[PDB]
Design a protein around this ligand. Structure first.
Ligand SMILES: Cc1cc2nc3c(=O)[nH]c(=O)nc-3n(C[C@H](O)[C@H](O)[C@H](O)COP(=O)(O)O)c2cc1C
Ligand code: SF4
Ligand code: SF4
Ligand code: SF4
Ligand code: SF4
Ligand code: SF4
Ligand code: SF4
Ligand code: FES
Ligand code: FES
Ligand code: FES
Ligand SMILES: [Zn+2]
Lengths: 599, 195, 156
């Protein structure tokens, strides 16, 4: 390998490519030709760096200088000012405190201080299209130990000693799944495995981050996986609408065939195991364990009732295993550094760290990977940089539609299995969404309730009929046609539906309604009795009032009223007919003085 | 052949493996409701009326296609499972046309028998149904999808026993209707008029 | 972008069917390359597929109508997409929807007569960190507001 004085990494994440990261990479190597330092300066397309708020991200090694909000208007400057002159520019360095101190390392900042990258240890660091960078950074060492010395019996003993439990949302020990696959004996001795990479819940975007960071570690765990249970054939499942990710992953398959890693007679052993891609196109219901089984076989995506388990009957009557990718990622970390390394972090019930993806009104937007046992209060304030613009935090939603809201009374909640279920919510994929006082919490429950109606697979009658029959109760409140006692009609369906569901949506569908009523009962009464939205969001429950002091009385809003509910004389503030307009709101923006407010 | 030992309501049974609790309890003179099931052809259990609680389970399971297992205890007279059956009953009845005076089937409709079977009284609900389209253009069979409650027994029997299978399920949610292909009529496709 | 082959050309269909027979469960994959090569699914085309496979129309038509990523209608030149995820919604994406309906004059899920502006319901492109998110063909605009909507719409 040729020695490089300087090394520069570029973020290839989804958020960075949205801003035009491919334009910058094209321009970055253009100036390397011009200034003739191309053979000394290395440009590498790496994965996401966990902070897409500051995207695109340019870090020059060995300096380790962080650049944020770099755009195409300053391409030739950064080549000359740092790669030639050897000095940084203070204006593009991120400054959390604002006092002029520059962090030397990424973990020195408030965003990365509590971020333990274990599964993401090498993701975002290596070149995924370069097989040499991974093997030079301690890669493919796990296979050389297990294919020569370690028995398939012994490896599942390591997992239950590690105490790993699945982060797919179910909270089940992983090593039991492994033993539930090993004991089953098929007629022809044929075994298959599966891989879940299908994320479709809103706010969850961490699933292909390991795919956009490192395809090599994903397939390496697959060879480990087939070695334990004796699998000769494997499938992996992806979505079609990620066009960048689908191309590069198939390229990494070729290098596995080029060295002989994936296939037959793997590393001069008797182990043979191969992969090829399956092309899904973004069905969130396919993420169910047996809905993906009949999706691949080409039938309707019906979720097959359990039992019989996916463990004993699967592809062509042969045993299979179902799990998501990020739980496969720490498996080489188990064998290289010991199971007690995994057990060194976390509480006594479950061990290790957990990976999340944040969203909502937050100052910094990105990924977050916290060791288990951390309070919720620490998450919003010093990790996310606090609430932007001084707003008032009301409730924080986890798991998207699959979970519930966490109000201000539960900031010292230890986020784990037994506490948040006792708080009536589940983590799922780990999406975190923060709400403030600026939006009404009534109709946002209908927003997650919008998701479940348009995605329901249509088999069980509650997840067909009971869903839309539960919308009209909310919207008649949302337009002011409701009556008292309708919220107690909601509580009739509250326990009926959850005990009467087959599809995985049905158990977890009404829980957003369940979470909010036991804290926010009073604000419904404002919607029901006072007929007023506290946030002024519900369109049919809001009215406009002008202020006499600030209004000029010019009459620009009088031209923009389609229902002509405003009238009067010039040079004086006008009169508003509340019942006559359709509450469209076209008049509030047309005033150049901002004289119209929501009541 | 394998022998399976299980106790229902405290009563121990030895059965051949693969038989389910429905017919085993029918052999023991115990009845479980059914709309979905028919022998040898349709075992999907989408009716969600045949619920029963199984000790050691997270949530409830339908007795129609739940396989038997050794050492399991079954109790069929808890208040919760009765409540579940009743609430599924009014959620079905809020879809399925209520002018059962002028139905053709009239006397021995299964839904009337189940409505009297669970003894439901109150319908507190107002809702919106499927579309009302009369396909009175064929020669023998007229469908009124305003009554159809998505049994999938029709499509199954036309699929396997007939081996004709000119019917399918389309749309999502309320648009999920059983239909012929291309939104045509039965006279416009190759229906055998088997009966 | 390559040309979309007109519907009267049946030889490509049978060539792809003869190519993709041996793999199990080939319905989903064969329908997606027909979507890539033709753009939309008119009735005769999927019927010829049922003739070639020797399997009847019901399951093919059902899986055509089950997934929203498959179309039964010819589509316009340019696609219009608002990220309808929670991260984009919570900033006020309903204002984005209402402004789109106001400027274009057609409701959501309606195709304009020109064959140029065409809108649908895209749930998440995955780039939710730059909310609000607006996608057209392979171009994504982020951290926008209602003000930027006519200027971006008038770019195309
Ligand atoms: C509709 C649906 C979608 C799902 N999607 C996912 C997913 O994207 N990722 C995931 O890990 N689990 C998903 N699950 C849960 C999986 O069934 C399963 O729990 C997971 O693959 C195994 O992890 P566990 O060990 O925690 O159960 C989904 C379930 C349903 C019903
Ligand atoms: S909950 Fe019922 S209707 Fe919804 S997807 Fe599951 S089985 Fe189908
Ligand atoms: S546009 Fe503003 S200043 Fe003019 S009349 Fe209306 S509210 Fe008053
Ligand atoms: S909200 Fe709309 S209809 Fe009502 S007064 Fe204002 S501009 Fe007119
Ligand atoms: S299905 Fe027919 S017979 Fe049964 S209640 Fe309805 S109308 Fe009457
Ligand atoms: S015709 Fe309709 S009501 Fe009768 S079995 Fe078929 S789906 Fe059910
Ligand atoms: S009558 Fe026609 S639709 Fe009915 S089962 Fe016979 S062939 Fe099928
Ligand atoms: S998307 Fe660029 S750092 Fe994450
Ligand atoms: S027949 Fe429907 S639940 Fe068994
Ligand atoms: S939240 Fe999914 S695309 Fe914006
Ligand atoms: Zn409100």
């Amino acid at each position: 390998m040729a020695y490089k004085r300087s090394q520069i990494l570029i973020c290839g994440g989804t958020g960075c490519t949205s801003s035009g990261s491919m334009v910058l990479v094209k321009e970055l190597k253009k100036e390397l030709v011009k200034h003739d330092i191309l053979d000394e300066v290395e440009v590498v397309t790496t994965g996401c760096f966990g902070l897409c708020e500051l995207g695109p991200v340019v870090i020059v090694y060995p300096e380790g200088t962080f650049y944020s909000r770099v755009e195409a208007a300053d391409i030739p400057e950064m080549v000359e000012e740092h790669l030639v002159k050897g000095r940084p520019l203070d204006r593009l360095i991120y400054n959390e405190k604002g006092d002029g101190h520059h962090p030397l390392s990424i973990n020195e900042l408030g965003f990365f201080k509590k971020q333990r990258r274990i599964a993401l240890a090498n993701c975002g660091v290596i070149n995924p299209e370069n097989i040499d960078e991974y093997i030079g950074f301690d890669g493919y060492l796990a296979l050389e130990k297990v294919l020569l010395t370690m028995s398939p019996v012994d490896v599942i003993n390591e997992v239950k000693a590690s105490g790993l439990r699945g982060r797919g949302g179910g909270g089940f020990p992983t090593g039991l799944k492994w033993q539930f696959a090993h004991d089953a004996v098929s007629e022809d001795g044929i075994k298959y495995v599966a891989c879940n990479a299908d994320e479709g819940d809103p706010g969850a975007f961490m699933d292909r981050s390991v795919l956009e960071g490192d395809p090599h570690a994903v397939i390496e765990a697959m060879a480990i996986a087939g070695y334990a249970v004796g699998a000769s054939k494997g499938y992996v499942y992806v979505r079609a609408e990620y066009p960048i990710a689908v191309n590069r992953l198939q390229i990494a398959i070729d290098q596995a065939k080029e060295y002989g890693i994936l296939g037959e007679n793997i590393f001069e052993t008797d182990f043979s195991f191969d992969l090829e891609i399956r092309l899904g196109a973004g069905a969130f219901v396919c993420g169910e364990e047996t809905a993906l089984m009949n999706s691949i076989e080409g039938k309707r995506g019906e979720p097959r009732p359990r039992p019989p388990f996916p463990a004993n009957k699967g592809l062509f009557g042969k045993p299979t295993v179902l799990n998501n990718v990020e739980t496969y990622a720490n498996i080489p970390k188990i064998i290289l550094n010991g199971a007690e390394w995994f057990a060194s972090v976390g509480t006594e019930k479950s061990k290790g760290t957990k990976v999340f993806a944040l969203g909502g009104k937050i100052n910094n937007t990105g990924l977050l990977e916290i060791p288990m046992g951390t309070t919720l209060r620490e998450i919003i304030y010093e990790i996310g940089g606090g609430i932007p613009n001084g707003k008032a935090f009301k409730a924080a939603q986890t798991g998207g539609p699959s979970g519930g809201c966490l109000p201000e009374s539960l900031l010292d909640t230890e986020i784990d299995y037994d506490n948040l279920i006792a708080a009536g919510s589940m983590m799922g994929s780990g999406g975190l969404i923060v709400m403030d006082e600026d939006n009404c919490m009534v109709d946002v429950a209908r927003f997650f309730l919008d998701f479940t109606q348009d995605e329901s697979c249509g088999k069980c009658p509650p997840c067909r009929i009971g869903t839309k029959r539960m919308l009209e109760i909310l919207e008649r409140i949302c337009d002011g046609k409701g009556v008292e006692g309708d919220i107690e009609r909601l509580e009739e369906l509250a326990v009926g539906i959850k005990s009467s569901a087959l599809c995985g949506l049905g158990q977890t569908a009404p829980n957003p309604v369940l979470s909010t009523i036991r804290f926010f009962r009073d604000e419904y009464e404002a919607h029901i009795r006072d007929k007023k939205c506290p946030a002024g969001v519900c369109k049919h429950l809001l009215d406009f009032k002008i202020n006499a002091d600030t209004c000029k009385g010019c009459g620009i809003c009088a031209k923009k009223c389609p229902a002509d509910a405003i009238s009067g004389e010039k040079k004086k503030p006008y009169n508003i007919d509340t019942s006559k307009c359709i509450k469209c709101g076209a008049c509030i923006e047309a005033c150049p003085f901002g004289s119209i407010s929501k009541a | 052949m394998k022998e399976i030992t299980f106790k229902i309501n405290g009563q121990e049974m030895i059965v051949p493996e693969g038989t389910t609790i429905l017919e085993a309890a029918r052999m023991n003179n115990i009845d479980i409701p059914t709309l979905c099931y028919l022998k040898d052809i349709n075992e999907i259990g989408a009716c969600r009326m045949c619920l029963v609680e199984i000790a050691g389970a997270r949530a409830l399971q339908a007795a129609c296609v739940y396989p038997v297992a050794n050492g399991i205890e079954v109790l069929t007279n808890s208040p919760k499972v009765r409540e579940a059956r009743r609430v599924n009953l009014e959620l079905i009845l809020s879809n399925h046309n209520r002018e059962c005076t002028t139905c053709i089937r009239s006397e021995n409709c299964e839904l009337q028998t189940l409505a009297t079977d669970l003894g439901v009284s109150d319908i507190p609900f107002e809702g919106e149904k499927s579309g009302k389209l009369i396909d009175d253009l064929s020669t023998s069979v007229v469908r009124d999808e305003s009554k159809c409650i998505l049994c999938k027994r029709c499509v199954s029997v036309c699929r396997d026993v007939q081996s004709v299978a000119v019917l399918g399920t389309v749309g999502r949610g309320f648009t999920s209707q059983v239909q012929p292909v291309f939104n045509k009529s039965l006279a416009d496709v190759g229906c055998i008029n088997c009966g | 972008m390559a040309e979309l082959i007109p519907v009267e050309n049946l030889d490509v269909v049978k060539a792809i069917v003869a190519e993709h027979r041996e793999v199990p469960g080939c319905l989903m994959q064969i329908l997606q390359e027909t979507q890539l090569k033709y753009g939309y699914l008119p009735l005769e085309l999927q019927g010829t597929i049922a003739d070639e496979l020797g399997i009847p129309l019901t399951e093919v038509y059902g899986v055509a109508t089950f997934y929203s990523q498959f179309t039964l209608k010819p589509k316009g030149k340019y696609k219009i997409g608002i990220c309808l995820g929670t991260a984009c919604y919570v900033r006020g994406s309903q204002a984005i929807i209402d402004k789109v309906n106001s400027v274009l004059g057609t409701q959501v899920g309606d195709t304009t007569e020109d064959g140029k502006w065409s809108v649908d319901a895209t749930r998440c492109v995955g780039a939710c960190g730059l909310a609000p998110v607006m996608m057209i063909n392979e171009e994504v605009f982020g951290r926008l507001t209602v003000d930027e909507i006519p200027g971006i719409l008038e770019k195309y």
